[PDB]
Point group: C3
């Protein structure tokens, strides 16, 4: 790849050199390797979470009696796990021969935690078998160990899919980079009240912006629109997971 020409930045004013943590450099290398290896498309969608939000907030009591804080992430994890089982091409990697897909029969999902030293993505194993408060506890633990440098490399491995949630900071949508060898990543942004047509008038519904980046060698455009559509459907009524 043609390199970027060096510039003497000090010709234009005062500069200062700060160094990169090894964690940032590892991260830098991994993203650029994904970038050049995966042809990326982002599919955007927004889900109606008015009812999900009401549930979240009502179970604040239960969650606190169990010591966890029920946020939107355990709900996101549960729903993507159900869906990764319904649409198995999202739960696979491209074989090194380029001629086969390795479909995984397990569902472990990573989630982005941004710490001082860099971004870490802890992995929760067998998300499909854990409950909303179990996933809530685990997420919280892994996030804390990630911030406190106590996260052993074991827990950063063998994920099938990544969720990256920035809803707690802001933004309308973003285009995340697929953490290869996984084949998709779900970006989640800030929810806001939007007017939604009820067939007769605009009702305010709470809308969650979803941004699915995927590896289009493996997942074609229609399979991906169907994944964010099913996800939007499941988050609008999470009871559909029960059937």
């Amino acid at each position: 790849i043609p390199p970027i020409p060096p510039v003497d930045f000090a010709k234009y004013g005062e500069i200062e050199e700060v160094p990169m943590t090894r964690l940032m450099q590892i991260g830098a290398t991994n993203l650029h390797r994904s970038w050049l290896n995966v042809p990326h498309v982002t599919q955007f969608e927004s889900a109606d979470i008015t009812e999900l939000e009401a549930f979240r907030v009502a179970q604040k009591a239960v969650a606190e009696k169990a010591g966890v804080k029920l946020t939107v992430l355990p709900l996101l994890l549960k729903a993507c796990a159900y869906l990764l089982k319904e649409l198995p091409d999202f739960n696979s990697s491209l074989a090194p021969s380029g001629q086969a897909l390795i479909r995984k029969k397990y569902v472990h999902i990573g989630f982005a935690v941004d710490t001082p030293d860099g971004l870490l993505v802890p992995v929760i194993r067998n998300v499909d078998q854990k409950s909303l408060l179990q996933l809530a506890a685990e997420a919280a633990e892994l996030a804390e160990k990630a911030r406190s440098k106590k996260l052993g490399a074991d827990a950063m491995q063998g994920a099938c899919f990544t969720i990256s949630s920035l809803g707690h900071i802001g933004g309308t949508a973003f285009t995340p980079i697929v953490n290869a060898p996984e084949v998709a990543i779900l970006g989640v942004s800030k929810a806001s009240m939007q007017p939604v047509w009820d067939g007769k008038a605009f009702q305010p519904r709470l809308m969650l912006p979803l941004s699915l980046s995927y590896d289009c060698r493996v997942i074609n455009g229609a399979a991906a629109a169907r994944f964010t559509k099913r996800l939007g459907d499941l988050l609008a009524d999470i009871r559909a997971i029960l059937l």
Copy 2:
């Protein structure tokens, strides 16, 4: 490009290998070749199609007496063909010498059809000379032959522009990949009723999300904002094509 490190996926659970159809592998190679060769920008816009939709629906009679189903795609094709003639840089390819553009004086447009074996993009020739019901019949035929493996390689060649419509499945917008050597591709997503300011109050207008990816070596940001703006203008009143 640095390769992706191989992972033993079976350390984390049960895996299964399914293979790729040759069609998927061809597709995979073409997309990655486009990805590394074309610096991509997506320009998003949404067009007001309330009136277009009313027309579509009124001519259901005519369309059925002629045996075709008038969908939004013949209308999209007709309008982009008019525009590919008004803005000829969108109807060209970059010469192999990198120092010239080959401007095409013809308008053939491909459209994405997603079949079981992979994605196919049949090409309708001289879209600029065919009528709405002609284009409707042709699209329908090519889509059927594409699904039934009866599409001869002849019909996959020499397109000037691609339309990729996922509006029938869902989504708010996506970032399509330019099928090089073409220089742009129009992604179309699901139409929904949106509140639009009439200078005094919000009126519900039916809005179609447009996502124009382009090769920014050939098309600069302003030329592309002007293309989706003219397209939004033409779809809001398709009679402008008549003049």
Copy 3:
């Protein structure tokens, strides 16, 4: 990178070869070099500029008595300059060793001007020290010299950040390419009246679409959501710059 197979475009109809200006070829090379070197993510946001717009329009008198036209660009420049100082990682470049960031202690910002011969990005030096009408005059001058080929290469150098505004043509959002060695670029699209929930009803507020592309080796997803969030905050009340 695998090359794109040559096609005989004249098999499908009449073609014509127009050549590229050296300016376009320079531009083409720079964008493709950025594309392959920088892993890109776009963060989207929209800012409430109802009040900013009212101010702009009230100071039409002052602006005209000073000979400049106060547009949204001097306001964008002032606010990003304040922010490039608050969040210094946005005002830096990656060292050639890949292991350090060169943080710049100066703020010069470039802005995209699209001319007949290609795109130029003049640089305004020390934007942080100039006032709204100063920046207004300077922008206008540089834009004119850029269109009239009288822009000396000196003024295209040593920028820290780029603003690319297409709001005057149209569009909902786009994904700009980072002009490496800079680490971010702000795309600005067309403002429109949107319904925004006041906690009780939807109020029409004038909304400006912001599209921040960044180099995710240097800037992680959360730092970027926080930059467009602070920017949206500053444009909703530009008096916050005063404190």
